Amino acid sequence: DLSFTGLTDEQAQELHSVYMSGLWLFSAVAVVAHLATFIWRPWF
Amino acid sequence: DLSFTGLTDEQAQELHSVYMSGLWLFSAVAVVAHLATFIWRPWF
Amino acid sequence: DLSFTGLTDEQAQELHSVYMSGLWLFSAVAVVAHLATFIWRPWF
Amino acid sequence: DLSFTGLTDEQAQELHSVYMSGLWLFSAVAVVAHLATFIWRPWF
Amino acid sequence: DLSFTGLTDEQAQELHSVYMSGLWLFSAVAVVAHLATFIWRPWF
Amino acid sequence: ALLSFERKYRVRGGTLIGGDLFDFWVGPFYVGFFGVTTAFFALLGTILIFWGASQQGTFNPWLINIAPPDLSYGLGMAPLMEGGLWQIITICAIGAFVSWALREVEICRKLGMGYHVPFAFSVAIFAYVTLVVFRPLLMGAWGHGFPYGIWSHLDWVSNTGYAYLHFHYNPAHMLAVTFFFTTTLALALHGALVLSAANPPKGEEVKGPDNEDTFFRDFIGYSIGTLGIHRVGLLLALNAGFWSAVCIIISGPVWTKGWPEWWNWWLEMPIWP
Amino acid sequence: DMTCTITCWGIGVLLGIMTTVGLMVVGWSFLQGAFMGVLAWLIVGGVLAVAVCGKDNAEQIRAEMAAARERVRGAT
Amino acid sequence: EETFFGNFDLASLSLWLFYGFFALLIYYLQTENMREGYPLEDEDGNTAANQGPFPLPKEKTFKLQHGRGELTLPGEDVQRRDNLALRKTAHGNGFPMEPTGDPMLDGVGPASWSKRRDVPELDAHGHPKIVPMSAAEGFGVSAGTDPRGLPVMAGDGEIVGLVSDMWIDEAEQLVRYLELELDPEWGDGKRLVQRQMVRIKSDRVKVRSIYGKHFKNVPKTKSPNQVTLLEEDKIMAYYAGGTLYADESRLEPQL
Amino acid sequence: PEYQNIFTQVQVQGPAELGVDNENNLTEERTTGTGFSQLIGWIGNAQLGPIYLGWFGIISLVTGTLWFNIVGFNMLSQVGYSIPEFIRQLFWLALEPPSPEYGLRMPPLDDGGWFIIASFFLLVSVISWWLRTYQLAEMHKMGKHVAWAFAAAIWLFLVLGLFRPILMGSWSEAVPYGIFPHLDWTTAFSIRYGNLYYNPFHALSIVFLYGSVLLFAMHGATILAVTRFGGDRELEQIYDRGTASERAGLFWRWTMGFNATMEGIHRWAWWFAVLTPITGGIGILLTGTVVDNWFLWAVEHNFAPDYTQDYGYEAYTTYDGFLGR
Amino acid sequence: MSKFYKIWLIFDPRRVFVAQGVFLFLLAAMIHLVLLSTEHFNWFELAAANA
Amino acid sequence: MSKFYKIWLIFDPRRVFVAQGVFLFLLAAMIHLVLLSTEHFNWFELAAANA
Amino acid sequence: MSKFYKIWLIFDPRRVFVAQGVFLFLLAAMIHLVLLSTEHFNWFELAAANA
Amino acid sequence: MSKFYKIWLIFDPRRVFVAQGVFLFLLAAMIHLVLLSTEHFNWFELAAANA
Amino acid sequence: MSKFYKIWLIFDPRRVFVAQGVFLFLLAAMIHLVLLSTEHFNWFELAAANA
Ligand code: BCL
Ligand SMILES: CC[C@H]1c2cc3[nH]c4c(c3C)C(=O)[C@H](C(=O)OC)c4c3nc(cc4[nH]c(cc(n2)[C@@H]1C)c(C(C)=O)c4C)[C@@H](C)[C@@H]3CCC(=O)OC/C=C(/C)CCC[C@H](C)CCC[C@H](C)CCCC(C)C
Ligand SMILES: CC[C@H]1c2cc3[nH]c4c(c3C)C(=O)[C@H](C(=O)OC)c4c3nc(cc4[nH]c(cc(n2)[C@@H]1C)c(C(C)=O)c4C)[C@@H](C)[C@@H]3CCC(=O)OC/C=C(\C)CCC[C@H](C)CCC[C@H](C)CCCC(C)C
Ligand SMILES: CC[C@H]1c2cc3[nH]c4c(c3C)C(=O)[C@H](C(=O)OC)c4c3nc(cc4[nH]c(cc(n2)[C@@H]1C)c(C(C)=O)c4C)[C@@H](C)[C@@H]3CCC(=O)OC/C=C(\C)CCC[C@H](C)CCC[C@H](C)CCCC(C)C
Ligand SMILES: CCCCCCCC/C=C\CCCCCCCC(=O)O[C@H](COC(=O)CCCCCCCCCCCCCCCCC)COP(=O)(O)OC[C@@H](O)CO
Ligand SMILES: CCCCCCCC/C=C\CCCCCCCC(=O)O[C@H](COC(=O)CCCCCCCCCCCCCCCCC)COP(=O)(O)OC[C@@H](O)CO
Ligand SMILES: CCCCCCCC/C=C\CCCCCCCC(=O)O[C@H](COC(=O)CCCCCCCCCCCCCCCCC)COP(=O)(O)OC[C@@H](O)CO
Ligand SMILES: COC(C)(C)C(=O)C/C=C(\C)CC/C=C(\C)CC/C=C(\C)CCCC/C(C)=C/CCC(C)CC/C=C(\C)CCC=C(C)C
Ligand SMILES: COC(C)(C)C(=O)C/C=C(\C)CC/C=C(\C)CC/C=C(\C)CCCC/C(C)=C/CCC(C)CC/C=C(\C)CCC=C(C)C
Ligand SMILES: COC(C)(C)C(=O)C/C=C(\C)CC/C=C(\C)CC/C=C(\C)CCCC/C(C)=C/CCC(C)CC/C=C(\C)CCC=C(C)C
Ligand SMILES: COC(C)(C)C(=O)C/C=C(\C)CC/C=C(\C)CC/C=C(\C)CCCC/C(C)=C/CCC(C)CC/C=C(\C)CCC=C(C)C
Ligand SMILES: COC(C)(C)C(=O)C/C=C(\C)CC/C=C(\C)CC/C=C(\C)CCCC/C(C)=C\CCC(C)CC/C=C(\C)CCC=C(C)C
């Protein structure tokens, strides 16, 4: 397997799964925030 | 297990619990202060 | 073979195959964006 | 068993207890001062 | 036992006992001075 | 009184003129032929300054002012109260400065050193002689020199710059200011590096030149070295004083208009559309 | 070969002086012609001290050095 | 903005505070520069009555590298010379001294050296810092004129020998010394010249400080591969003394 | 004449130095790759590189390049995207601070909003370069003199751009980003508040700047005259006194009656240089907030000179006589 | 898209976490300043005018 | 989400704690100062004009 | 066209990924700023004008 | 909360005590001066107007 | 509360005493000057008024 960092396939898979769980939480909050600002003050 | 800092999994589980205990107290105080500022002088 | 980076032919095929699949996603979002903006405000 | 400064657990408990005593004294004095100030000249 | 300065427990106790005696005398003189000034020209 | 290691260096010889007639020390000071000429000139100049202060009417160090003559006197001599004392004091100051340099030369010769310090001091003498002798002679009157007063020689600087409207736009003044600022940044860096090498945190050993070279290549990717930094500091300082003399000698005898207008050659170059 | 470098810089100084006088005959002022003269000096004199002084003498020595660099590569 | 009293405002208070701070800083700076050469002495070696207006500083310690020990200053003078061939020309203080024998051989005046440590200076790895080029892996002349093989001319116009090697500082990549092999007519062995005292030309190398007859008395190093600090000081001071002692016309007034 | 030691006679080159290391492992973040320049080597060292890349340096470089491009692109757009005119008027263009009517609030992007966004990126860049200078000493196990000297100049930087505008109550008090426009700011600042010559802290700053330049002429010249005795190896002269330090001290002792040591002259240099921006910032912070006319302040405190003669050209000559008619 | 986890077999996971945090703060800070440079979207000024 | 504790296997707590303290104080101070530069939200002028 | 994968036998992916990322963001920010610099495509002024 | 004592297993008390003292005094001085700079809360001027 | 003496086990008394002395004198001088700057609490001008 090609590896520049030193991690293995399982380790990378696990790190990625926790990283994507935080991407979605941050992004879901951003979606709710953006939806409330348009109902208050529409742009577009 | 992968570890860059040197801590072990159990040491990391104990430190994160204490850190979250402090974060909630901070956020719980910040919430009551924002509610009083809104009843006193509301934005939006 | 000629390799100045020390990767093999198949490892190169693996990296490229993964890279193009993100390139296509980036290009797709950008086209839906440009379309919404021309309908919103044409520039030609 | 984790430590970055060289102290042991029991020494840290003893230092924290003294620190909390000082903090509570300071906070009580500040609370009385703020109460007297608010009675003398209100800001809300 | 913890010591970053080189003193022992008894030496620190004696030094603090001497220090607080001067602090209290300074505070008493300041208290008497602050009382006479209010009787001559009040500030609250 | 001597330092612990000074006695073996106090030998006879190495004088330009005077032999052993003036070859001795007074306290820590060395005297020679040029030590006697410096004392005479400096004492005469100071006594004349204070006599002029007494005749002016104030002894306040902030308010003492001895001024050059009117422009109507040209290059002749004025009455001693209307600007002649300034001329005499100028002659005395030139003599004192030249004697100081020639005394440094003899000290260098006696110690077996190079002659870099008198050569460096000659540049500062050249900037002063340009301000009180060269520009005034070219412009045609001694009244173009600056007055001898702590707060009155700043009024001269202010009025001389607004006589060309916006002095910041003088091309050779911009070069001179850059040299001054660069010398101060380099002096600060050099002093900091040497002190940080010689004074480590408590409980650590001292460092050497290798460590100093390494810190600077890590910080900015280059290190001039322990010998190059002194050459560069000297060259920067001497360039600062030379360009200062140029900025003042062109402002009067070479250019008459405002300094912004001088830039017109760039704004109307034929290449521009 | 620091003596060929100094020669090349002096031919640049001389070309700069000639650029000033030539633009002045054609209608430009001194300072306009002298900015162009300074650039002729710095660009051309610099270019000639890299190119001409870098054609250093060596004859079969040049050959072997190059044929051996061509052996470093091939296994690099 | 108001004043505290009279004409005294915030700017005046700031100015006077800076005055006080600057006075304390001047005291600190002058006291810090008195860790060498004190207490003062008279011309007979006794402690002088006057010691000046500033008292002496307290002690600092330096921890040296490579196990050389500790240095505490201010302290005793360990670089002091013992028996100097000098003579007073007056009964009091303030007059020069006269050499008793040969000033260049006795190390007095502009030829004086200081008693430094009898070990070579080390680099970061603990190795001698200055090494002859014939033993320095990878070094070559990259610019300038190479002086090896050229004859050396003295200050009076005599050829005394040939340059055989160069001694370089490998950490800083700089030439420090030139090594000269003497002709039999002008002495025997090898000598060193510091780089700052030579002018290298196309056909010769010029040393103006000393004459040919002075080249046999240049101090010699013990080992052919390393030089200590004491030897460095004695070699450099010998060449420096020739600027005044080589000829009798160099010592008399030039007028 | 004797060799003077301004240019090296012969250069020698060997393997490139990669630097010292300790338990902090500085090698892991250093770039590989070096060069050599024989033109520079006539004066100093010839080796170029390598450099250390931490996070502080990378953040500083990125945020400083952003500031540069917001200014440069605003300057380019002000001229109509005309490259030849952009080159013609490069020294005259600028990114202007906001108008005084907006106070400390956020101004329109056309009237100072881009100026505030770019100022926040320059701030971040400068504070990051300082954290790098502190970390490298800590990692190299040296003193923190360099970081303190840098913070001395950062003090005046922050006074000019951040502190004084806040205490005055307007973002319009800041300096524009331009070559000529920033020099016009200096002259206008001096004119608006009387005469800046009569500010005592400005005079003290000038004193220390003059003193710092006089000291590098003296120190550079003195060190170059004792290089025939090994005087450029200063650290070993500190650890073991030699004849170079003795002669250097005795020259100044016989010249002006007192002298320094090898270690102690660098403290003098460090303090004179450091004292210039501190006094300058204290002087700038007092202008407008406390004192509004420095010449009237000097008249109040009695150090303003008085002149007896009259004003006017016809008190000294005639218009016809000045023309030769 | 199902093999995007191999980004961690190319980039170190500490280097990425520092850069992403710093970038995200500075981007959120700048957007709030652009909204407040306006008239329609400055909420502090709209509370005063709805009064 | 229940494995966020592993953030301490990558980041050193000392540096994170120091940076967090400095960041939090600076952010709070900045927010308190923008409110005072507005008219409707300055609490001192409000008390002054209420009486 | 089918042999384009070989760019990864010439160029190191680690360097080009960082280079790309920086290049991409800087290009996007420049277009938005040019768009914001125009009178017809400034979407913040349209919201104020439209209503 | 019972385990907040373990802060001393990460931070050196010597540094934080000095930092806390400097911070507290500077903050108190700044607040007192800000109060003195207003019109409704200057207590020296209130006595002059109540007398 | 009864174990405050251990503050001398963390801090060096020699530095603390000098810092204290300087701080106390500067604070007292500043307070006296601030009182002198006002119109109701200047005791030198009240003596002139009452005569
Ligand atoms: C009409 C003109 C006015 C005048 C108006 C002013 C004003 C206004 C000011 C000065 C100031 C100064 N004046 Mg004045 N001054 C006048 C006449 C003079 C004369 C004279 C006639 O000979 C002299 C010698 C001076 C000299 C001086 C200096 C002593 C002083 C600047 C201090 C300093 O540290 O500078 C060096 C400069 C700095 C330290 C700036 C800080 C630089 C920062 C740290 C850079 C950060 C990095 C950067 C952003 C990155 C760049 C890119 C890199 C390549 C990566 N003035 C007249 C009276 N003067 C200043 C001062 O302090 O006033 C008291 C000041 O503000
Ligand atoms: C006040 C001091 C200023 C300074 C000076 C400075 N920096 C320097 C140099 C100098 C004199 C170099 O010579 C060296 C360099 O090689 O620059 C191209 C360098 C450098 N400073 C850098 C960084 C840097 N310096 C900074 C600051 C500063 N350094 C200030 C502006 C900063 C910031 C923002 O504060 C940064 C980020 C890099 C640009 C570079 C790091 C050197 C490096 O990585 O070298 C790698 C080696 C190479 C192979 C490149 C050399 C080029 C040639 C192909 C080699 C052959 C030489 C040729 C004969 C001559 C060309 C060299 C010229 C520089 C003369
Ligand atoms: C690159 C040039 C820099 C420089 C170099 C320089 N100056 C030097 C040296 C060097 C290398 C010395 O070795 C030498 C020295 O010994 O320094 C300690 C010196 C020196 N330069 C000095 C000062 C000085 N240098 C200055 C600047 C500079 N000198 C430049 C920045 C300045 C200013 C204005 O910026 C000053 C004030 C002296 C401290 C010193 C030695 C001068 C000296 O002692 O001369 C002998 C004369 C007397 C003791 C008294 C003479 C009395 C006169 C007869 C009467 C006074 C008349 C005077 C004109 C009145 C002026 C009134 C003002 C208010 C206007
Ligand atoms: C004590 C006061 C003096 C002083 C000291 C001083 N300055 C200092 C220091 C010190 C002690 C440093 O440690 C620090 C330093 O790094 O020095 C090498 C510095 C420094 N002082 C500087 C400038 C400076 N100092 C000045 C003044 C002074 N500094 C005083 C004279 C002045 C003026 C106006 O006189 C200037 C202009 C910098 C060189 C440096 C601070 C470096 C810094 O913070 O950089 C931030 C970087 C960016 C803007 C990002 C990079 C973006 C660039 C626009 C382009 C890319 C970089 C490239 C290398 C440059 C372009 C060259 C090309 C060929 C590639
Ligand atoms: C008012 C008095 C001076 C007269 C007025 C006219 C001149 C004014 C200008 C300059 C004054 C410099 C005079 C210095 C002459 C020194 C003579 C000398 O040699 O004095 C020594 C004693 O001195 C020293 O040791 C050095 C003194 C400091 C040098 C000057 C510093 C200039 C710093 C800053 C620049 C100054 C600008 C102002 C900033 C205003 C700031 C608000 C005796 O010998 P010693 O053996 O060294 O004794 C000591 C020890 O060893 C004990 O043993
Ligand atoms: C020849 C004609 C003269 C030219 C005429 C022009 C007039 C002006 C020129 C020069 C004035 C300087 C004159 C003073 C020189 C005295 C000679 C000297 O120094 O003689 C020493 C005797 O010492 C002294 O007489 C000590 C002098 C004390 C210096 C004061 C220190 C601070 C001073 C300044 C701080 C500055 C800050 C700001 C300032 C504002 C604030 C001041 C013999 O020494 P020694 O026997 O070897 O040993 C003994 C040694 O250790 C110490 O006692
Ligand atoms: C402001 C920008 C940052 C804001 C966002 C930060 C939080 C975002 C989230 C995460 C990143 C935080 C750091 C966590 C990691 C800590 C430890 C670590 O690892 O990284 C550290 C972390 O470095 C940073 O976080 C850099 C931040 C620099 C910002 C400075 C800007 C100026 C400051 C203020 C200006 C404004 C005030 C004006 C008014 C007042 C007037 C001034 C470097 O250590 P290192 O050892 O070099 O790291 C190499 C590594 O690989 C070792 O293994
Ligand atoms: C100038 O133009 C204007 C003003 C208009 C603009 O504003 C222009 C703006 C842009 C052009 C903006 C462009 C913006 C972007 C491209 C934004 C992109 C943003 C993201 C991709 C954000 C990603 C965020 C991800 C987050 C928050 C992830 C968090 C993850 C975690 C907290 C969990 C991590 C923990 C792990 C992995 C532990 C596991 C460890 C082990 C050891 C197993
Ligand atoms: C108007 O717009 C402008 C620009 C003006 C803005 O204001 C914009 C502002 C923003 C964009 C703001 C953004 C702000 C954030 C993203 C804020 C985030 C804040 C947090 C995540 C805060 C976290 C706080 C956490 C706290 C306080 C934790 C405390 C923990 C502890 C006290 C416990 C310590 C742990 C120990 C001792 C462990 C010990 C264990 C051992 C094993 C030794
Ligand atoms: C209006 O808006 C503006 C901007 C003007 C503001 O003012 C905004 C202001 C803020 C945002 C302010 C924010 C302020 C804070 C967050 C304040 C926090 C304060 C504290 C945490 C205070 C803590 C105090 C603790 C004290 C006083 C402890 C004292 C301890 C001791 C006195 C001694 C105990 C220790 C000993 C003896 C050591 C024992 C030793 C052993 C070996 C066992
Ligand atoms: C109004 O707004 C403005 C800004 C104007 C203000 O004025 C604001 C002001 C403040 C915010 C002020 C705040 C002030 C303080 C917090 C002050 C604190 C003061 C103290 C804690 C003072 C302590 C004094 C202690 C003393 C005097 C102690 C001892 C003295 C001794 C002489 C004894 C010492 C001797 C010893 C220990 C001998 C050694 C013994 C051995 C056994 C060896
Ligand atoms: C378009 O072409 C390309 C792409 C090549 C370019 O990018 C070209 C770029 C240029 C041609 C650029 C030219 C740039 C200049 C000429 C720049 C000149 C800059 C100066 C002279 C700047 C001086 C700056 C500052 C001064 C004098 C003092 C103090 C400043 C500050 C402290 C700034 C800090 C600001 C702060 C803290 C406020 C931030 C606001 C907050 C709310 C936090």
Ligand SMILES: [Fe+3]
């Ligand atoms: Fe030095």
